[PDB]
DNA sequence: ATCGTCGCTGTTCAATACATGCACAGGATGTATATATCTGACACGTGCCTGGAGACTAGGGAGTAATCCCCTTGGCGGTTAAAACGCGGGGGACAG
């Protein structure tokens, strides 16, 4: 079981060289929630996991 | 213009393959050993005799004491060459 959530926004408010970027969770229960989104659409469309 | 993306490259980092130094099984060649076997050289027994043993003598070689003096030890001192100590360095030893 894995899950993505879709973030469409307006405008570029990222590092648009940086296709993906990391976040650590504050514990280890909650270290797969919210840990890495994405960049690679045309739209400025950010994918987290 | 203005931003983003797509063709063209270098530079570094990591992964892999190769080369070099080291130990440990593996065989084969010789040595040691196990065994069977047959031999002739050693040990003994016998028989025979020459060299060792016994008994005696005579005689001189050696042991023994008594005397001699030569040779060896010993102490002393005086110049004196030889031994001893030290220095410096060179060539001979010894290892790679």
Known sequence: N???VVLCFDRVFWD???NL???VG???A???E???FWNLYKAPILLAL
């Open 30 to 32: 909650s270290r797969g």
């Open 16 to 18: 648009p060289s940086v």
């Open 2 to 4: 894995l899950n993505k």
């Open 26 to 28: 504050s514990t280890t």
């Open 21 to 23: 970027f990391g976040h």
């Open 34 to 36: 919210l840990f890495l």
